[PDB]
Amino acid sequence: QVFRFYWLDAYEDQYSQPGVVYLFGKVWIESADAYVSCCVSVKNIERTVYLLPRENRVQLSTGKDTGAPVSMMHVYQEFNEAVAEKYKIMKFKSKKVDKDYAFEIPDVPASSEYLEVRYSADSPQLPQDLKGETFSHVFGTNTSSLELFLLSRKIKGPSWLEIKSPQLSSQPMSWCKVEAVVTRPDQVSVVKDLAPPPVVVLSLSMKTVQNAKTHQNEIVAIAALVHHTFPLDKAPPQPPFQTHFCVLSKLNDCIFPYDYNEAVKQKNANIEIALTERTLLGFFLAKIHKIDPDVIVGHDIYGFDLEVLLQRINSCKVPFWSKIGRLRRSVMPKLGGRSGFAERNAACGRIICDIEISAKELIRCKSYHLSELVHQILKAERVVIPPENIRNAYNDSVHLLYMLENTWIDAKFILQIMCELNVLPLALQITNIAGNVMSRTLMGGRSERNEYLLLHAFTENNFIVPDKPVAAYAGGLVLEPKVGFYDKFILLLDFNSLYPSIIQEYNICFTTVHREADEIPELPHSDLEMGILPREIRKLVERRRHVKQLMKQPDLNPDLYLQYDIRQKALKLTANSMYGCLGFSYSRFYAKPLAALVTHQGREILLHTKEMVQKMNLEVIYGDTDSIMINTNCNNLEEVFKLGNRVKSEINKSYKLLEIDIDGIFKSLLLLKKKKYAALTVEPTGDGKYVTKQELKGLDIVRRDWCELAKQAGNYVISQILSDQPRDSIVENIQKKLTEIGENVTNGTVPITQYEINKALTKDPQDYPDKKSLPHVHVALWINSQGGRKVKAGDTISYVICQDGSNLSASQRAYAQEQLQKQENLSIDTQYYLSQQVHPVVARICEPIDGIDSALIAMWLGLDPSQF
Amino acid sequence: ISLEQIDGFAAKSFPLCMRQLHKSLRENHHLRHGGRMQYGLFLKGIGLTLEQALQFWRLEFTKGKVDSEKFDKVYAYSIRHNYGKEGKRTDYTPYSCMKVILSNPPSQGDYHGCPFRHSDPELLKQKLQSFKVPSSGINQILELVKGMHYQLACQKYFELTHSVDDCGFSLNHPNQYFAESQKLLT
DNA sequence: TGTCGCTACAATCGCTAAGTTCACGCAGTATCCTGT
Ligand SMILES: Nc1nc2c(ncn2[C@H]2C[C@H](O)[C@@H](COP(=O)(O)OP(=O)(O)OP(=O)(O)O)O2)c(=O)[nH]1
Ligand code: SF4
Ligand SMILES: [Mg+2]
Ligand SMILES: [Mg+2]
């Protein structure tokens, strides 16, 4: 009679169906000998509130204190007589329950007894500011049915579920294969210690041509790759895809080449040619229904792809729209609106993966457009079809098949990127750790993850969490650097998980710090028991430490090693975000005093560590909120290691959990400013043999907002400076290279891409006020002016500042590379680059270098020293 | 020409323009630039030498309680010039009656120009009465003036003052008036 | 509809003050001017 299935996504409609939550997942049917998607509708998910009684009865209008003690019988009497009648709630279940509370609502005791009342979600919801003579507060008034269900059944991320007494739906409600109705939340349970089942992943890439008559983007091809047994706890399979399908259509007026049919047949692929975009969308929806993929992956799927799909579905009036998801509906959600909420709701029951968002979250790259990601991750070169060529493709079989195969290659690259970064396993792991829904986790962001983590923690400990909410404080201390060049050994010490360790050690928690609603609250007494937040953050830190130790194993697959590094970085960022969300104005758990206390303790620790190291007769040259740089003034590495171990032991001696470890040993350093240095990191090879690896931190060479010519020049200059060559040879080589680069720039022999400069976007190109015209924004608008996919917020744009005869400021001459290659009146501003991209960076880099000055750099660049 | 006889000329021979200029100079012992230029050119026309004019002007200007050193400093160069002694060194010619009529119009504190043109009819009548001119002669001169016949009006003055029925000459120059007066008298 | 935290550096734009040009002028001195 039981019913075991592995749930993946949950969807609730607060307005349409009250007190109903749908769980979508996979269920094993023996007959098919494979997993089949199933949907379970948990009905009658009642709504629960909590009432805080007064100490003595109080007149509502007089605001008096009659003196009559208030007990739970009186509270029930008041809610039964006044409130129940007023708000038209008929049946409710009342009980006395003792719960804990430590959050931001004044005059709420740490522990008290409340009259827990539940009633059907169809009944009206009580006002958030409700009050009465017998009670001073009502909680959980606006609690979402999904949240109530998840916290009531202690469901924490995707996992195997056991359902009791399943029933069948009168009429179909979902597009899945098996459906089941649960009459009560109590009938759903969780079973542990079973591997997740492989799921179906569908990677789709489409090509669209805009209808400038309406500027509406019409789809003309959809290349889709599918694998039906993609694992969620093992490595990605090779090849990543099992089978595939391609659908190709024609424009509104244009026609197919003569023998398109013969070429398509010779292609031997599962190509289905749709006469009209209506037929193409119908075929695509039928294919999605047949495969019923559980994880749809794509590039800009949340911003462009799904929105275009839904818009064209609406325009062509394709009957069964809801088949794009897994539930049955009739009216498509209104489009527009920020975020991908329209997309996610439209695709309810399917986990949408946007490799753009996932890549932004996991790794750091100069640009997030698909070609750059492909070159960086997969180390491959992508051929891009301009939209004009896409329009021109309906003129020959060869070009039409090339376009379709390019769509197929784009889909394959998207799937390859998803597998390489290991996006799905990491999403599953982080969702299990946090306890939220997987789709939200893959949507990006840290707030919801930490909020749900703490929700689960507190709920399991008999707490009442606050209702969802319908440089404020000091930070770290950066020591003043001793700018200069150090040719001896530098010892870098870094604290391990500093803020998490502080939270653990000092027992900082909502239930330990007695706050007050900008003074730093006192440290909690050492007598108190460990709080909830130290426990959760300790679990996260322990998981990260386990992963790091696993990374220590010798002879590991380097790709697997990089995946482990990504996972460790993700866990580190999760813990740091757990800290940060305490200081997030919009967070459910805003505890700015706690964050201020944490940062204050960090500053105190750093000051004490600096004092200790200086008291050891050792030079201190730098430190950024958890780290210290020491000048060993030694040339032997063994002695350096001995001193490092000494000082590390002395520092660790003063703490219970915080540990200091040797981050790195720099053979040479060029300390320029705060958060800006380059060093020759030393990684021992064995038997006294060490290998030197360059390491740049914060310089302009490691910023995407500089022309790659400048980056190359700075990299060479740093390489010369940090080398062991005699100083005269170093200066001579610097001068010679600078002269060569100046000649190359003057003669136009540099490749054009080296003049590109990348700047991201913060808002939509239109929403930017008329604050003159920010260079990138300028070009951004041009991109939207032209007939191509628009550039929205958070998009990198590469512009080249070029001569145009305008005698205007450089900021106002930003141009795309295609613009320069097209227009015959635009030429690269060589002087601008030589004076404002090459000179500034090298001049800043070589400030502490003897023999080099602004005038000399200008001369070797061929410029006029006058302005310098 | 001699300095002393200049007074006699001003009494009798000088035309009403130079007559008024001389009266103003002997009342004030100083002339503005326009008056100085005009009177110097006229004295050049009659024949007064550069030395004689310099001496006369120096002596007259000194009587206004001013240094003759300042005069030698300032008016010496001008007196040199108006006789064409310095600068362009051109023997600048005395003004003709047409120029005097069309020359710079005098303003308050000025006395240059042709009195017949730059004097109001009442003032001209009063001046003529002062000169004991017969009422008929004054009326004829006024009639000539009203029709803008200032040359003819001056010829009438010359006829009346010299006791000659007809002028016999077309008066077109103050120095010409001076020469005609000298011819009739001497 | 959600949107982790703070600190530091670099570049650019706006606005405004400080400074510069520099043309107003003056006090002092000088030369060269006007018609027939
Ligand atoms: N909220 C927040 N805090 C951060 C972030 N990055 C750094 N911090 C803070 C909290 C970290 O504990 C502290 C020390 O920086 P680190 O990069 O050395 O990380 P941590 O020491 O925690 O661990 P690690 O040295 O990498 O093993 O700086 C961040 O992105 N968000
Ligand atoms: S007409 Fe000639 S001479 Fe007579 S007052 Fe006039 S300017 Fe003098
Ligand atoms: Mg650290
Ligand atoms: Mg004068």
mmCIF file of N, CA and C (backbone and C1' of nucleotides) in Angstrom, chain A residues 338 341 446-447 471-473 475 583-584 673 772 811 844, chain C residues 1-14:
data_model
loop_
_atom_site.group_PDB
_atom_site.id
_atom_site.type_symbol
_atom_site.label_atom_id
_atom_site.label_comp_id
_atom_site.label_asym_id
_atom_site.label_seq_id
_atom_site.Cartn_x
_atom_site.Cartn_y
_atom_site.Cartn_z
ATOM 1 N N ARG A 338 10.282 40.631 -13.501
ATOM 2 C CA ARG A 338 11.695 40.380 -13.278
ATOM 3 C C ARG A 338 11.938 38.904 -12.983
ATOM 4 N N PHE A 341 10.784 33.964 -12.899
ATOM 5 C CA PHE A 341 9.603 33.401 -12.256
ATOM 6 C C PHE A 341 8.539 33.023 -13.274
ATOM 7 N N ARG A 446 22.403 33.141 -3.065
ATOM 8 C CA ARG A 446 22.771 32.546 -1.789
ATOM 9 C C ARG A 446 21.749 32.769 -0.687
ATOM 10 N N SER A 447 20.833 33.724 -0.847
ATOM 11 C CA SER A 447 19.955 34.086 0.259
ATOM 12 C C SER A 447 19.009 32.944 0.610
ATOM 13 N N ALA A 471 27.430 50.364 3.676
ATOM 14 C CA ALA A 471 28.196 49.770 4.762
ATOM 15 C C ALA A 471 27.531 50.051 6.101
ATOM 16 N N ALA A 472 26.498 49.272 6.419
ATOM 17 C CA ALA A 472 25.770 49.477 7.664
ATOM 18 C C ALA A 472 26.611 49.154 8.892
ATOM 19 N N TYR A 473 27.763 48.513 8.718
ATOM 20 C CA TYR A 473 28.601 48.124 9.844
ATOM 21 C C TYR A 473 30.035 47.962 9.362
ATOM 22 N N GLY A 475 33.911 46.452 8.807
ATOM 23 C CA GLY A 475 34.407 45.265 8.152
ATOM 24 C C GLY A 475 35.787 44.895 8.662
ATOM 25 N N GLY A 583 23.776 39.945 7.760
ATOM 26 C CA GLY A 583 23.798 41.364 7.468
ATOM 27 C C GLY A 583 23.140 41.729 6.151
ATOM 28 N N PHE A 584 22.059 41.044 5.793
ATOM 29 C CA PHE A 584 21.309 41.329 4.577
ATOM 30 C C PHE A 584 19.977 41.957 4.958
ATOM 31 N N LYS A 673 50.239 48.173 -3.573
ATOM 32 C CA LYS A 673 49.264 48.838 -2.721
ATOM 33 C C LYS A 673 48.497 47.779 -1.941
ATOM 34 N N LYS A 772 25.894 61.201 -19.250
ATOM 35 C CA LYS A 772 26.707 61.215 -20.467
ATOM 36 C C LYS A 772 26.429 59.892 -21.171
ATOM 37 N N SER A 811 35.883 58.513 -23.774
ATOM 38 C CA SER A 811 34.731 57.807 -23.229
ATOM 39 C C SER A 811 33.582 57.712 -24.221
ATOM 40 N N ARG A 844 52.132 52.306 -12.971
ATOM 41 C CA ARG A 844 51.731 51.902 -11.629
ATOM 42 C C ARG A 844 52.527 50.690 -11.162
ATOM 43 P P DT C 1 4.070 39.338 -8.277
ATOM 44 O "O5'" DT C 1 5.617 38.955 -8.418
ATOM 45 C "C5'" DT C 1 6.327 38.436 -7.297
ATOM 46 C "C4'" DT C 1 7.663 37.859 -7.723
ATOM 47 C "C3'" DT C 1 8.642 37.594 -6.580
ATOM 48 O "O3'" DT C 1 8.634 36.231 -6.192
ATOM 49 C "C1'" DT C 1 9.622 39.108 -8.143
ATOM 50 P P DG C 2 9.464 35.780 -4.893
ATOM 51 O "O5'" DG C 2 10.988 36.023 -5.318
ATOM 52 C "C5'" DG C 2 11.997 36.148 -4.325
ATOM 53 C "C4'" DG C 2 13.382 36.015 -4.937
ATOM 54 C "C3'" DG C 2 14.536 36.205 -3.968
ATOM 55 O "O3'" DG C 2 15.697 35.515 -4.415
ATOM 56 C "C1'" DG C 2 14.400 38.079 -5.423
ATOM 57 P P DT C 3 17.037 35.539 -3.530
ATOM 58 O "O5'" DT C 3 17.721 36.939 -3.900
ATOM 59 C "C5'" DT C 3 18.354 37.111 -5.161
ATOM 60 C "C4'" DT C 3 19.087 38.439 -5.225
ATOM 61 C "C3'" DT C 3 19.753 38.866 -3.927
ATOM 62 O "O3'" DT C 3 21.074 38.354 -3.848
ATOM 63 C "C1'" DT C 3 18.484 40.680 -4.846
ATOM 64 P P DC C 4 21.363 36.975 -3.080
ATOM 65 O "O5'" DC C 4 21.771 37.432 -1.607
ATOM 66 C "C5'" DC C 4 22.809 38.377 -1.424
ATOM 67 C "C4'" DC C 4 23.449 38.217 -0.060
ATOM 68 C "C3'" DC C 4 24.393 39.331 0.338
ATOM 69 O "O3'" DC C 4 23.686 40.429 0.886
ATOM 70 C "C1'" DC C 4 25.395 37.228 0.795
ATOM 71 P P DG C 5 24.272 41.914 0.727
ATOM 72 O "O5'" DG C 5 25.537 41.931 1.703
ATOM 73 C "C5'" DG C 5 25.345 41.772 3.097
ATOM 74 C "C4'" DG C 5 26.671 41.726 3.836
ATOM 75 C "C3'" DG C 5 27.610 42.880 3.558
ATOM 76 O "O3'" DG C 5 27.276 44.011 4.351
ATOM 77 C "C1'" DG C 5 28.809 40.825 3.495
ATOM 78 P P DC C 6 27.558 45.495 3.806
ATOM 79 O "O5'" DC C 6 29.109 45.723 4.109
ATOM 80 C "C5'" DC C 6 29.617 45.475 5.406
ATOM 81 C "C4'" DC C 6 31.131 45.437 5.398
ATOM 82 C "C3'" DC C 6 31.803 46.740 4.972
ATOM 83 O "O3'" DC C 6 32.926 47.029 5.786
ATOM 84 C "C1'" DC C 6 32.491 44.991 3.541
ATOM 85 P P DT C 7 33.702 48.425 5.610
ATOM 86 O "O5'" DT C 7 34.923 48.072 4.643
ATOM 87 C "C5'" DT C 7 35.924 47.173 5.082
ATOM 88 C "C4'" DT C 7 37.151 47.234 4.193
ATOM 89 C "C3'" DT C 7 37.613 48.636 3.820
ATOM 90 O "O3'" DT C 7 39.029 48.714 3.884
ATOM 91 C "C1'" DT C 7 37.140 47.418 1.846
ATOM 92 P P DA C 8 39.790 50.071 3.496
ATOM 93 O "O5'" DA C 8 40.174 49.852 1.965
ATOM 94 C "C5'" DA C 8 40.974 48.745 1.599
ATOM 95 C "C4'" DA C 8 41.514 48.908 0.196
ATOM 96 C "C3'" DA C 8 41.792 50.350 -0.210
ATOM 97 O "O3'" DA C 8 43.063 50.462 -0.820
ATOM 98 C "C1'" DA C 8 40.217 49.357 -1.719
ATOM 99 P P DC C 9 43.579 51.885 -1.346
ATOM 100 O "O5'" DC C 9 43.450 51.748 -2.926
ATOM 101 C "C5'" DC C 9 43.737 50.504 -3.531
ATOM 102 C "C4'" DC C 9 43.602 50.583 -5.035
ATOM 103 C "C3'" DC C 9 43.911 51.947 -5.633
ATOM 104 O "O3'" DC C 9 44.746 51.804 -6.758
ATOM 105 C "C1'" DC C 9 41.686 51.286 -6.208
ATOM 106 P P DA C 10 45.253 53.099 -7.551
ATOM 107 O "O5'" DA C 10 44.274 53.161 -8.805
ATOM 108 C "C5'" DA C 10 44.027 51.985 -9.556
ATOM 109 C "C4'" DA C 10 43.194 52.294 -10.782
ATOM 110 C "C3'" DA C 10 43.395 53.696 -11.343
ATOM 111 O "O3'" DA C 10 43.535 53.658 -12.752
ATOM 112 C "C1'" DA C 10 41.098 53.366 -10.762
ATOM 113 P P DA C 11 43.821 55.010 -13.567
ATOM 114 O "O5'" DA C 11 42.407 55.352 -14.215
ATOM 115 C "C5'" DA C 11 41.636 54.314 -14.790
ATOM 116 C "C4'" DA C 11 40.313 54.842 -15.299
ATOM 117 C "C3'" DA C 11 40.362 56.272 -15.830
ATOM 118 O "O3'" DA C 11 39.635 56.392 -17.045
ATOM 119 C "C1'" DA C 11 38.791 56.121 -14.051
ATOM 120 P P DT C 12 39.569 57.802 -17.811
ATOM 121 O "O5'" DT C 12 38.135 58.370 -17.408
ATOM 122 C "C5'" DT C 12 37.027 57.492 -17.394
ATOM 123 C "C4'" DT C 12 35.742 58.236 -17.111
ATOM 124 C "C3'" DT C 12 35.694 59.664 -17.648
ATOM 125 O "O3'" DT C 12 34.439 59.928 -18.255
ATOM 126 C "C1'" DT C 12 35.349 59.676 -15.296
ATOM 127 P P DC C 13 34.157 61.348 -18.947
ATOM 128 O "O5'" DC C 13 33.114 62.034 -17.956
ATOM 129 C "C5'" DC C 13 31.984 61.299 -17.520
ATOM 130 C "C4'" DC C 13 31.107 62.139 -16.618
ATOM 131 C "C3'" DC C 13 30.997 63.604 -17.026
ATOM 132 O "O3'" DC C 13 29.643 64.025 -17.017
ATOM 133 C "C1'" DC C 13 31.877 63.421 -14.796
ATOM 134 P P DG C 14 29.269 65.547 -17.362
ATOM 135 O "O5'" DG C 14 29.068 66.203 -15.924
ATOM 136 C "C5'" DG C 14 28.376 65.477 -14.924
ATOM 137 C "C4'" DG C 14 28.221 66.301 -13.666
ATOM 138 C "C3'" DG C 14 28.076 67.798 -13.904
ATOM 139 O "O3'" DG C 14 27.039 68.322 -13.100
ATOM 140 C "C1'" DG C 14 29.981 67.371 -12.522
#
